[PDB]
From a paper:
The RAS–RAF–MEK–ERK signaling pathway (ERK signaling) regulates mammalian cell growth, proliferation, and survival. Activated RAF proteins subsequently initiate a cascade of phosphorylation and activation steps of downstream kinases MEK1/2 and ERK1/2, which then phosphorylate an array of proteins leading to specific cellular effects. Our structural findings based on co-crystal structures of Ponatinib and PHI1 highlight that each inhibitor recognizes a distinct allosteric site and induces distinct dimers and αC-helix conformation.
To gain further insights into the mechanism of BRAF inhibition by Ponatinib, we determined the BRAFV600E-Ponatinib co-crystal structure at 2.1 Å resolution. Its pyridazine group establishes hydrogen bonds to hinge residues and the methyl and trifluoromethyl moieties occupy the hydrophobic and type-II pockets, respectively. The amide linker forms additional hydrogen bonds to the catalytic E501 residue, which however maintains the catalytically important salt bridge with K483, a signature of active BRAF conformation. Interestingly, the activation loop of the kinase domain is partially disordered, whereas, its experimentally determined portion adopts an orientation that docks residue E600 to a unique position compared to other inhibitor-bound BRAFV600E structures, most likely a result of Ponatinib binding mode. In this binding mode, apart from the previously defined “adenine”, “hydrophobic”, and “type-II” pockets, Ponatinib forms extensive interactions with an allosteric site defined as back-pocket IV (BP-IV) according to Kinase-Ligand Interaction Fingerprints and Structures (KLIFS) database. Indeed, a comparison of Ponatinib binding mode to known BRAF inhibitors illustrates distinct recognition of this allosteric site by the methyl-piperazine moiety of Ponatinib. These interactions include a bifurcated hydrogen bond with the backbone carbonyl oxygen atoms of αΕ-β6 loop residues I573 and H574 and hydrophobic contacts with R575. The BRAF–Ponatinib structure corroborates the dimeric conformation of the kinase induced by αC-IN inhibitors, with both protomers occupied by Ponatinib. Interestingly, Ponatinib induces an intermediate αC-CENTRE position in both protomers, which compose a perfectly symmetric dimer (crystallographic dimer).
Residue numbers in the entry:
A (entry chain A), B (entry chain A): 446 to 600, 614 to 722
Write the structure that this text describes.
């Protein structure tokens, strides 16, 4: 039952504020070591806010994997809050797009590989991320990928990871395993090029229209010269405009693991 | 309910055998990346073996902390098995007592600190380890302590970590939070001296008798010259012959965290 992960009031020490976001405000904290606490920052949660809290706790409780941010518990007083492990360092987004760090290809592949492990796990439990993007991939201790859904803005933007069908939305719910695969394709692009797609287009509404219609797609000729050819091909497959031509994660993971195994 | 963490048959790939032990046989495996699988290696589990399996799953399910080995799931077919994350490297025992590695003091303190985090967490949930010893402290990636209860023999032996009251056993069940604190004291000794206590005594039965009676205790004059004085004092307190003079983990952890914070 849910109360097994309830942390009684008074035990958590809230420290430095990290950021407010779409899912609450995040702090560093102490509770049997370092933790992160995401607070619903709100005077009277409505029943919808309560349901959403419950939903996040419910899904996080189903995850036990080294590449999924570790859920540790929740509290309902002093306020609504979710507690996770504390990750040191910063996001993949931060490393690629807003830092002097340039990773070696082995490391780039290892990041890809870990990210694929996490996603394969989530898909195996029928969990659809919907917000996979480099800013939701934390490089804990610069080494271990932790996927989360942090809701913190970068230093929609996020429309860069959306599959064509997600942008078009001609049915109610266009999200799927295959849409997460597309987003993962865009993370691969980021890794293998160092860049965000469509850097030479300055109108987010044209990017939206054009990706939706199939007239614009990421320029794969930009991948670095030492990107393995099978990586570039997998990326192309993850980015297929037609949802059902994209591969599934078990195959994605196996093929990346094969690339990583060869580079010693 | 328990079945939420059941992994269906066929999904796990069992690889290299690691060791048989007191709690089953351990293999490296693949399941959405690397895992360890501990197999009950047995043709017809008795009801006691089944209960013990359930007990291990039940306790491991209550743990979500970065310094407790991550439980991931179990199977009941092909055989009884528990699945955890795969730890790279080796045990603390291995590093201190059977390797060329000599750690710096900062690192030794950080190991102490992480181990204290894990133990404080387990005690906060009323979990008594009973087998805390350096061979049950894994240094994952040489950096992150993962406490488990692996049951694998080293390259009782384990009587070295037993508090006097545990050896004497004048009541049925001499185990407690305070007995885990003593064992942690002996891990501190290992860290700060590089050695097992009582290396100049070759009769395990005399060590047993004498620790039980209070006539023999670890020689703390052996700690390395750069061991902080407050560390040496905490170790002395964790090793108190009288159970109730030993500190609790919240205090143990706070004082180690204070030592670690000062060394930058
Ligand atoms: C305190 C906290 C609480 C919660 C979460 C959080 O990630 N929530 C989460 C919600 C849902 C899902 C899965 N769903 C996605 C939606 N989808 C519709 C359904 C499936 C997942 C996922 F991991 F499974 F992806 C995570 C993160 C933080 C953090 C933190 C933290 C830790 N270190 C640092 C360092 C700097 C900054 N922050 N930080
Ligand atoms: C597959 C597997 C399954 C289970 C366990 C296991 O640790 N079980 C466990 C049972 C009980 C308890 C707590 N109780 C102690 C008793 N006490 C009476 C009650 C409280 C805990 C603890 F972590 F909480 F301590 C752990 C470990 C392995 C492993 C592995 C593995 C992973 N990487 C490697 C690399 C090399 C070798 N092995 N390996
Ligand atoms: N990082
Ligand atoms: N290690």
């Amino acid at each position: 039952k849910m109360d097994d992960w309830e942390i009684p009031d008074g035990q958590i020490t809230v420290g430095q504020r990290i950021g407010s976001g779409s899912f609450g405000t995040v702090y560093k904290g102490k509770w049997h070591g370092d933790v992160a606490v995401k607070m619903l920052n709100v005077t009277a949660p409505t029943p919808q806010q309560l349901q959403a809290f419950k939903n996040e706790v419910g899904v996080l409780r189903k995850t036990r994997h080294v590449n999924i941010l570790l859920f540790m518990g929740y509290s309902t007083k002093p306020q609504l809050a979710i507690v996770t492990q504390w990750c040191e360092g910063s996001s993949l987004y931060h490393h690629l797009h807003a830092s002097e760090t340039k990773f070696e290809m082995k490391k780039l592949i290892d990041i890809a590989r870990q990210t694929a492990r996490g996603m394969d796990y989530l898909h195996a439990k029928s969990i659809i991320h919907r917000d996979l993007k480099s800013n939701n991939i934390f490089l804990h201790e610069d080494n271990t990928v932790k996927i989360g859904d942090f809701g913190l803005a970068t230093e929609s933007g996020s429309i860069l990871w959306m599959a064509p069908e997600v942008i078009r939305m001609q049915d109610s719910n266009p999200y799927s395993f295959q849409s997460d695969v597309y987003a993962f394709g865009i993370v691969l692009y980021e890794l293998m090029t160092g860049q965000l797609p469509y850097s030479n287009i300055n109108n987010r509404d044209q990017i939206i229209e054009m990706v939706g219609r199939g007239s614009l797609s990421p320029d794969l000729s930009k991948v670095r010269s030492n990107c393995p050819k099978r990586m570039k091909r997998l990326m192309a497959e993850c980015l297929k405009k037609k949802r059902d031509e994209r591969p599934s994660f078990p195959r994605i993971l196996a093929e990346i693991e094969e690339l990583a195994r060869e580079l010693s």
